Amino acid sequence: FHLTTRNGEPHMIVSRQEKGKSLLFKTEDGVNMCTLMAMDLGELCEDTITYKCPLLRQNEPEDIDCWCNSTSTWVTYGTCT
Amino acid sequence: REYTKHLIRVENWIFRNPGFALAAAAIAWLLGSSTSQKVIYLVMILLIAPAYS
């Protein structure tokens, strides 16, 4: 995935071949591990969706398919197939 | 007692004797011979009946 930013915050452009794998990227505050569970994750195209993966410390996830454990991150991926 | 004391006496004496009522109309129909004017008797009679005056 391409690591960029959105208003000072880290942003992940996730491609199709990354579905199902732990997303890791270094940050001043250590190594960040985001987890992508999006069922509709497809091919990067015009039909993108973009949203935030909250920071989750010792809390079970609820009503979400993306989250990081060290620093909140934005994520973007296409839905095409 | 003053409210029913005049009435209760009558409501007994009739229950003892139905008679004076039964013939009362005869005294009535032969007295005054008009409707109401002949009714006021049949009330006045059955009323003076349980009395001693």
Partner: protein, 390 residues
């Protein structure tokens, strides 16, 4: 094949003549009909209103009927921290919605409770329709003025002139005869109505219905084609989730529209212009017209009736003839009685003339009722043709 034939072949044909000299003559022009005018020592003319179209009428409103969505973005805040926002919520090309969604420890919030969420998607119109307003003025009527000569073809068009209820009196030149002057009035066609255009196919629809259509639109005087109004009409926002929300766009509405317009008067069109069947009232003056060919010789020769004399739908006949001994000349036509004593009937073709040797010169004439002699030509073989008009 001959000049003036179009009007002869029409069932709706009016014959008009001026009761004065130099005066104005009134005529009524209709689509599918023609008017033939005549006057003493003046050529006979044919008039036809062939086209009535609105040119560049004001565009009222553009409606989007099919769109796509891209870059859908979601933002949301925890209970207690106010309404979230996205800067694209200020970009007129996006459709956005504000909602509330449950939040809590499971999705990054300290408190359980409703939180504010917002979602935007770029809206891209892929197919739109536009309704226009036709002004009575700026309507343009096309009228053809054809000289009733009978000359042949199979290069001789009648003068075509285009006018507007705002244009001034027209002076039309007819090669060889001079000019004819005329003025017209769109004398009674309505326009609180609107003309809907769905990809080269149009309809006439009532206003307030067009204006009520639940579809994204843009004020007529636009060119951006991006800042659509009421995009939510083609967009649906699914129930939100803590951090994301889906947005889907309805499918094309071209179909819902088509099978919705059935009933309303369909309007023809071409080259982007709308066409109508107009109605005109005109007045014309012929003081500047004159006969083409005066001062020639009187054919002194022969004619062979090219083919079977024809009867028109208007109590008249069309005789084809072709010279013979002479110059491109005048023809001696004359319809008399059986005794050839007095003149009867009259010519619709006037000052009939021959331009070439072996050039069928059609001639339309009006024979009197009953019996008459059609005398074509001069003294070698003056052509006596018997005729009976029933």
């Amino acid at each position: 094949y001959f000049q003036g034939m179009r009007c002869i072949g029409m069932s709706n044909r009016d014959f008009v003549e001026g009761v004065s000299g130099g005066s104005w003559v009134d005529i009524v022009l209709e689509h599918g009909s023609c008017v033939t005018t005549m006057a003493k020592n003046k050529p006979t003319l044919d008039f036809e209103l062939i086209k009535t179209e609105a040119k560049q009428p004001a565009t009222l409103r553009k409606y989007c009927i099919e769109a796509k969505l891209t870059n859908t973005t979601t933002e949301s805040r925890c209970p207690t921290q106010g309404e979230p926002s996205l800067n694209e919520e200020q970009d007129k090309r996006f459709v956005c919605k504000h909602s509330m969604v449950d939040r809590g420890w499971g999705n990054g919030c300290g408190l359980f409770g409703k939180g504010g969420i917002v979602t935007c998607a770029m809206f891209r119109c892929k197919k739109n329709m536009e309704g226009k307003v036709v002004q009575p003025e700026n309507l343009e009527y096309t009228i053809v003025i054809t000289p009733h000569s009978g000359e042949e073809h199979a290069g001789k068009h009648g003068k075509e002139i285009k006018i507007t209820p705002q244009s001034s009196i027209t002076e039309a030149e007819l090669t060889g005869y001079g000019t004819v002057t005329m003025e017209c009035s769109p004398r009674t066609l309505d326009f609180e109505m609107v003309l809907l255009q769905m990809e080269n196919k149009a309809w006439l629809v009532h206003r307030q219905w067009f204006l009520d259509l639940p579809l994204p639109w843009l004020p007529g005087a636009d060119t951006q084609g991006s800042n659509w109004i009421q995009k939510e009409t083609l967009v649906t926002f699914k129930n939100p989730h803590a951090k994301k929300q889906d947005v889907v766009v309805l499918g094309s509405q071209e179909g819902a529209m088509h099978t919705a317009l059935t009933g309303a008067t369909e309007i023809q069109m071409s080259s982007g212009n709308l066409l109508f069947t107009g109605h005109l009232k005109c007045r014309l003056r012929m003081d500047k017209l004159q006969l083409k060919g005066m001062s020639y010789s009187m054919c002194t020769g022969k004619f062979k009736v090219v083919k079977e004399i024809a009867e028109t739908q208007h109590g008249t006949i069309v005789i084809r003839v072709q010279y013979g001994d002479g110059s491109p000349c005048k023809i001696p036509f004359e319809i008399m009685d059986l005794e050839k004593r007095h003149v009867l009937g009259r010519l619709i073709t006037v000052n009939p003339i021959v331009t070439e040797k072996d050039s069928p010169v059609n001639i339309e004439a009006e024979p009197p009722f009953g019996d008459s002699y059609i005398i074509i030509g001069v003294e070698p073989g003056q052509l006596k043709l018997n005729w009976f008009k029933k």
